[model samples]
Target: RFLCGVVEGFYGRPWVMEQRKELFRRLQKWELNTYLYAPKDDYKHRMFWREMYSVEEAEQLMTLISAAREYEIEFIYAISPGLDITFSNPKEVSTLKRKLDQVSQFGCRSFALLFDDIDHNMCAADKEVFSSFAHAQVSITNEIYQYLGEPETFLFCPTEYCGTFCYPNVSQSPYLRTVGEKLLPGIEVLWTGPKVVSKEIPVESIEEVSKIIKRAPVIWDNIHANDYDQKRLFLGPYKGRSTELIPRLKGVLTNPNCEFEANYVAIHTLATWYKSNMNGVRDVLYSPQMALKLALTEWLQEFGVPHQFVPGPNEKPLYTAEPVTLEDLQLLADLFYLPYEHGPKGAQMLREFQWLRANSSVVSVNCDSEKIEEWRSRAAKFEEMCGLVMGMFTRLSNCANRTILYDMYSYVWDIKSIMSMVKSFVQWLGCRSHSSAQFLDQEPWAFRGGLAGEFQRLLPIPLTPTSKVY
Candidate 1:
């Protein structure tokens, strides 16, 4: 399967409600067609549990889920078994079974049975001892599947494959494989990202297991939307970066690891859809500069700062760049929302943007080409802003934790910073901006239908909104 995903941690109650429209729109724009309901904390499993539903509540929740379906994104409900299950004793299995039965009545078609991130004490050493302990739980799953009668629709994600926490690596245990082979051929195994919170899972491992598993595997890549420090948003391979692994695998599922991980939900969803449909995918990722411009244009409108980006359709690079000016700040001040928009933090970002723009251009960085040195120069410039931006971001890290905000800042800054320095380097014979103030103010948008329009047409214009600086 061409697997990609938004890990669970990136989304939560508020962000989902606020950005659901744009989120879905992006999914459709990127050609993503699936969603995994993977919430880490215990409270997040309410949708999967069987509850006494008033018609009003059921209708409302159904409407909420319907939004995803509207965009052709299938939602798969995941219920974490260990660490969060309400039942203290074995008897809880009966209660869970009843819940599954009840939820099935409400019409949830797909599910994920997750046993990831729990205490090791839960799984005892001896099979006889552990089987006695786990039998009831396994029985519940088997019974639930039998009751639901939808064999191929369910998914299983044991903590064993969740990377860093080895407590649940049940490749040693015959339970899941046994259940799949004998009891339920419908169940699919969850392959975690390479690191505990990483989404870059090794493709070779996926290849190895595809030969063994009876059904196709589900990829639970934890890239975007992770909350823990070990993980960050917006740092992963592009949609078509990896080789295809579809026929060997069955389907692809994503787990955005954070409360705001849903932002990239569309990106991965599109990647998987393309990968599954085609043997491989070749995609175009906007350079950091273009990504920033796109994000800024979109986000500014979202923040109540009304502004429109006019992307030159036929430009060679397909993006427009105008120098920062006082008029831009005034327009932003009138349109933007309060302290949050132009506060100390926003100002710092604007400064960083300036610093990056002072030195970079779009063509050399994100646009993949035969020119190797261009990428290297861009990389060096990106690293330049790491120290400056990292320190500024630490202050607002917790409050503005979502991938939308974090990624919007980091990606733009990194690329711009890199392109800035690279464009200014001495050794790189084609120093476009070196020793020339005239070049700095040369707005690409000013150029007419020739190279300028061609650039904008070919490039990815800003997907989000931006902060105007005088």
Candidate 2:
């Protein structure tokens, strides 16, 4: 009965229809019950909120709904009207209703109205009409909920959808309190825990919000989201959360990476977490490693699977590629794991580099040859590890599927470039005592040189960034 699944609620290029249908298949196979469609770039769902969808758009949505229905997955169609909906305008209210009615005609019974990422201030007209912003949102939501005959699933995403945005905290926030007291009891609320992309969602946090929300909040989990920073990728296991919170929540809906193929681990691991404690067996604790290996074990097979191709003029010499191995996948996961923390190998490299930098004096001009060799050995090991990443990169380039390859290409490319920079730095450190610290003068200051990077430097522990730095 718990609603464990995904929400395609990210700001990016929306996934194609085939990708969505494929997701429904995964949802069925994993027994995860739903997929809420709320891609932020879908202008009709957001910026062009008042405009009616063309028949072509309607056909696609209707067909998608059936695709989900066939897999017994609830396709909750979410529209984000917070960009410019005038709640005070009767015309706006009517249009909102008409839109939902049309989607309902398309056989979409479940719906969501997102009021997130919008300006907090309302127009003077709305101020005269409604008591507060929450009131306006609540009034419209209630009307739509009833207008649709009170569907079994209806979600409301508040403007302040996370704890950080809840002014004066959850219990005291006038906005949240108004929402809790005024919004229809039948409607569920979506929350993103402490941060927009929460590194962890403690049960205590959920319990606190539920007391004031007056309903169990469905987590809009953004643990694996990379939309905020295209430079990173999350291939890590679902962690820093236990199955204990499963009962406290109405359900969980993850907003994962924008790339569809890159989400294999993110979804697979959540599926593991979902099933582990479903029957309440404390003896069987959910293991992220077990879940990760389980995903990777299968993911490795996907790489081994081949595709079709022929030589020029029917030469028939088979096109072969160096296949990716389990170790390669493991290294890949280690290099680009999660937002909260790096993988073991990644951390090891960090620690080793930190130590080498601190003890660089050992490799100085007058230091013992033995001490120099010791420093060089660790540096060589680090270089060896970095070299191994390229091997992984090459094999991935030789992948059977272009969709899968390109989905993750940019991320791995980014990591590879950074690793190369790191390698160059370490090599420079080894020879810097006798030579100038200028091995690669070209494109110096190009790495992390933006105003964002400078601001990040000012606060080593940035309180507002999507991903944690440490």
Candidate 3:
């Protein structure tokens, strides 16, 4: 059973009960088989892991779990107790058991224990008992596995969960080797490639970790994660992973965007990538562009769902709601595509701006009508791209689904404001004096002056063709 699904393992407001129910429905439709339940901010999940769920809270969780089971999706419950737990203490161990045992009675057989983002040092008692941090975690995990009747599909997220977290490198880390040799053979370890937020996860790195961990590691892929930056969102397709790595790994799960509504392309494209390689034939059948098309085709129906837009006693409203198109959604995804890369249209738009600035001097010296016409045409092309963005924002804000607007309005507004300023600047560039600078001509106090501001304004340019700066 390869573990392929979503992990609700982000650092913000968890999706509401209604949203999770909708997610289960979509997951089933998309043919994904599992969902890991681990929201880091939930008090019962991390801060107060030692306590039992209240009767009211327990019922709420049971209902959500039941919803997942009805959809035939495995809901693996995860808890984080590494912050204050003294692993060597008898009482603390039993308290941990009591908390998990209660969850077991609620029709949950799958479980995971997270030790991520915790202190490297351990308690005094555990320091005296176990030889190392890995040994302590291993001993506790093994005991928990035995106590739970050896359920299948258990997961463990170690403190050194990525390559950089390991001292020196993967092969030289003794903490990893200890877990590899000592931990129970039936369980699986979670890895996040070479970095916590990896740009590209090499197959070689996975192969190295599999040999050291002595098992095929389940990748907790963070290619679509955007919780670290508040102004960012990832609508990128799943990429930078080859189909060849499928057999060598146990599973791959995406820890995606904080906004649940913005994840159609992220999850849809991953399923496209994963399912293409499931058959014996090695030929790649998936394309990012085609996958995005498939996602938007289905996603349009979601936005097209009719709702009550007319407020009460407002029959004389002047505004008319036009349906959203796939083109509109396409432009929206392009502007905020990925953490390390941009979509095709987005890249082209950026290149157009760079060229326009570099060749602005041509209008003064050459005065050739054809050359100036070419310059104006390219700038107009950029204006067209900006028009699509503004159009999408207008249509999306008028969507029948009020929830969509609230979840996304601010993000679209921010980008729209910037695009407006850029349009104005490019228009002004056509006829400005060579000696005058628009921004610097204003008050010197207008811009930031500290070290942070200095770092903000350095425009990056790659030195050569082979440079990775772009």
Candidate 4:
């Protein structure tokens, strides 16, 4: 079976011990079998690569290792010595082994050596001892594998780990070719599809890389990774690759959201995808819409919120009825992501505003008081929704999981500002007359300027402390 799992390889504050233990439990429940420990900012893993873990640190790791073993998960302790290693130095090589040996003493049988996010060129001393940079890496990795008794699991992440990062290109890069030729065959190589945060992974792309690397690649999947953007959280489903690509992969391991609580949907949907693949199911394609619905349904219930679809503007008011589903919440989440400002949800929201303005003519002319009240009622419903979301944000902001909810509450405030303006417009439309046309026309910036202008003013202008115009 393929080694499907998770890699805690993001660059940010590492997940706490309780989070890792819970993750292992979830991994077992989801049938995931591997977990790689390689948090980028963990001091022992990177900045102080040569030093052994202190007594307290070792104890924490042993706890994690024991937790993984309890769930039958392979605990892979990955060391990233690339940032400052003197690859040619004997002492440096020995230091690397000593660290792994210590992890071995904790009963960690699987290991990974990450050579990513570091300088591409070799040091002056390394240049004299090795023919090429790739050869230096291969030599050390092979020696380490041998030292560890060539354990059942060993993984390596190359400097050219993605197609775009390859010197010139994946096929012709001399560094990749050299590593493929010289590295130990038993060691599994990790690849991050075509790009570091690839949107899609085509079968042809994986096929090409596998031939070059001389083995099937272990995908370090980053589809749901949000470390690069703070204002965005990907609530969309797993997509961009056909299910047919599963057979060609050694395994798929996701490096997901930095905030622990926000990752339930990302990991849950991935387990669904992986299970489908292992069942000999082929030609299955998952759409973002489908994934969003499934995720929201489960997530809503998990949060003690109702999953029933709430009635919208055109329907008769049902005061006590739950009118929103996971679909609507996910849709709102997608809209708040500025990158999706022009997405379908945004467009849909824009159309609703336009329709409201178009219908305001009836109120302006005093042709139908009942219709005027109807619009007010709809506006009130929307305002209530906005207030409810703010309440949710207030509740989340006070909890232990406030990091991921940071963007949410602020975004809710933005929505509240817009909703307040909409309510004002509805009131203005209801009370307008021809006599007040000029007065309404010259209304305050909060009304006449609209949400767009309000939003523009809310945006921060980019300026440096020393920047000035003459």
Candidate 5:
């Protein structure tokens, strides 16, 4: 069966047991069928892989495994022993088997041994026992695979897991060739497209990797992973991959954002794409716009903060002003949210206002009343957008899931301040005469450095619209 699903393989705090149980239900609903347990910082899973799980830990894991089984999801227990392991040592191999054997008793039939994000150099003993690093890994992995009675599924994550990370290059890498030739053909290999967080996965690239890996690559897709960039969250739909490539691969699994509540869109759209492609549909495509709109509508309601003002604890009235839908506010925030580089479904209208703010004739003394009014009109439009974003920021910050987005609030706060400052500056310009330097002197020079200036430097501006704004 195709192993389409989610990988709980992230850097930060792993999701709680309840969260994982809920995730299994979500996976069932979405027609996805695998969940890889590889939280990098999970103590027993990574830092102390040699140690067996405590009774309490074992109980929790068994419950999760049972829940996954109940939902018909493949609960793949993953261990990252590459951080520090003696591959040549018989004791270490025994420890690996024992750990997985314990999990096997818990009814986990699928397993993965992850070696990504670790030092590729072999230890002194490993170097003596095996000809190359890849050989050592293959030896240990194969031994474990056989030791576990040759389970129904097994996966391995190579240290050089992507094309760029491979020695020299993808097609001709010695490490990859060795892995393809030496590793068991039944043992599936995991790969992140070309780069670690690839913006696009070309069919040609997949074809190349397929030839080298000797098996269709099970994509450990990191497209929606936000662990690297805390300031950004991807609510965008999955794209840059054509549905033509779906049949050419073993499966695809997303390692999405660490924020549990933030991944509805990522998983939802992947399911949408998977169902569309797997049902024998030809040349399928998923629209990011429609996906995001639906995602926001549902996600907001799920959080109980649906496109409307949510009152904070001990706050006055919830409806003090005209409330904006969560979709509208999120889309407006996307304008300045760097969704083009960050995610998608951002508004170009606010981006046009960004250009107008920077390039307008009214940012100078050579402007007429028409230009000034035009600039003011743009500024007002921008102010409304800023207010919309700030209001949303406040709502999110005050919501129950506030801690998940604390850093994001900082970015939005900076942008809102810059917008407000621009609005005030434009209003100040309206009072001054044609050739007034007085407004420039009246600027908030104190707010010139730090986040204020940083916000200006990274401000989103559109191309091909200098004439309109000017």
Candidate 6:
């Protein structure tokens, strides 16, 4: 349970004051009590520091921050200076500083200086430019940390952008050394799923990375979020607690990607797992009866699952687990967050999953396997469950405002469970066959012998400013 929350896209300006209130209500309902004021394409606040916003725009953003504060949500401003060309030009450093100052003024106490999704290889040839880029980022962070002046805790998302398949032409996008060395001392590296979905970090890699970063790394697991439909995402949660119990790990953070609006339940579920001890989840996640009871009871409580058993003010749940009844289908539906009058879709999906569980052999069933017609056919029906559940939870998220933080649009429990079973099956087979990483050239990055080539790509040349660049 590290600093948990979402980078948001919802914000209302001065004219839409009522909309802000409504948004706040949604956050509260969904158990999302925090927001990252780092909308990827926000324009108004984006240029605030290049120069002061025309008085009108400043007033509007300030109003939005005020609305957030009123609802007890923490506002964390994310400044991505080096990536966005407008913010990256060395000449405009002062303007960027001014923007940070203005954003700080909006009463956001904490901030994350994000350097994500940029081509690091661009930094290769120009030493002075690369040094300037790295130092500029650190300097801006220092300035902001000093400006905030109190409660100095902030979250950082530095993207050592990585790719799955190794191609000689493809640059080593997410170089470890650069991130470990150049970025801020306390900055956290955000991961985009694993190198590929279902890929586990080697124990050696974790041990080596721990030494470099000097702390246990945080996992930004991309589970239910794949915006680009082409991605071959692995369906289930982390290798059934193997990931949760990783050694030298500080804590966990989740960004299910575009799935937020629909699959808040998955977020809630993960939040519960993160808050609970790894010791307990072994029993909780595997035991269907236990998981079911917990799912029902856990959904009723707030302040995360770990705190549910503790006593304090705001500790009492709105609905108690006892006195469970059929009338509670409405309550259960609301609790499980599967309420919506979408056709017999959920039931159909469940029925199909039951069929798969009963018949599908003891092998990893490729979710996209062309050979498995029935399984592939059920994809639409599965999406229907996501659609129905997402629709209901979205309304809940909006109504509660900042309380319920949701990620994607669909929750694929059956698929997730099936994958978990398949993964377990594979592990058992490997254990029996006595598999080992003996001669397969396990050191993929190191063996390639061009580690330097990887480092050169992170810094793309600063964009030529739209306004005449000298």
What's the CA RMSD for each of the models? 14.9, 6.3, 6.7, 8.7, 6.7, 17.9
- Residues 215-261, candidate 4: write the lDDT tens digits: 88899988777788654566556767677777887788889877776
Per-residue C-alpha lDDT of model 6 across residues 233-335, encoded as one tens digit per residue = 2222223334334334544444443423333344445444544543333134343223334444544443232215655666774333332232232222332
Cα lDDT tens digits for candidate 5, 1-470? 68899999989988999889989998898788989999998999999999998999889888989999899999899999998899999999999999999999888999989899988787788988899888988998999988887877899999888879988989998888888998887789999988998888899999999898888889998988878754566667777777777888888999988878667878888887777778442233666566666666766654434326677788876543444357644663354332346333335544645577565545556436766677767767766765665576555555554533553455556655655555555555444545454543233454556585678678885543211211
Which residue window of length 10 is worst by lDDT in model 4? Answer: 461-470
Evaluation by TM-score, superior candidate among 1 and 2: 2
Q: TM-score: which is higher, 1 or 4?
A: 4
* lDDT (10s digit) by residue, model 3, range 111-220: 99888889779878899999999998988888888899988988999888999999768997898999899989999999988899888888899989999899999889
Pairs with backbone N, CA or C atoms under 3 Å apart (clashes), candidate 4: 310-323, 310-324
- Among the numbered candidates, top TM-score falls to 2
TM-score to true structure, per model: 0.54, 0.90, 0.89, 0.76, 0.83, 0.50
In lDDT terms, which candidate is top? 2
Instruction: Give the distance in Å from residue 25's predicted Cα in candidate 4 to where it truly belongs.
Output: 1.2
Of 2 and 6, which scores higher on lDDT?
A: 2
Q: Candidate 3: worst 10 consecutive residues by lDDT?
A: 461-470
Q: Put down candidate 2 lDDT per residue, 344-388, tens digits, no spaces.
A: 988898899888888877875653777788899999998888888
Any runs in candidate 4 off by more than 4 Å, and if so which? 279-288, 304-328, 336-347, 350-470
RMSD of 2: 6.3
- Identify the runs in model 3 with alpha carbons over 4 angstroms from their true place: 279-282, 306-321, 364-370, 433-470
Candidate 1 lDDT over 75-112, as tens digits, reads 56666656545333455666666655545565566666
Clashes of each: 62, 0, 0, 2, 2, 45
lDDT of 4 at 152: 86
Q: Which residue runs of candidate 5 sit more than 4 Å off their true CA positions?
A: 281-285, 305-326, 329-350, 360-363, 366-370, 394-470
Clashes of 4: 2
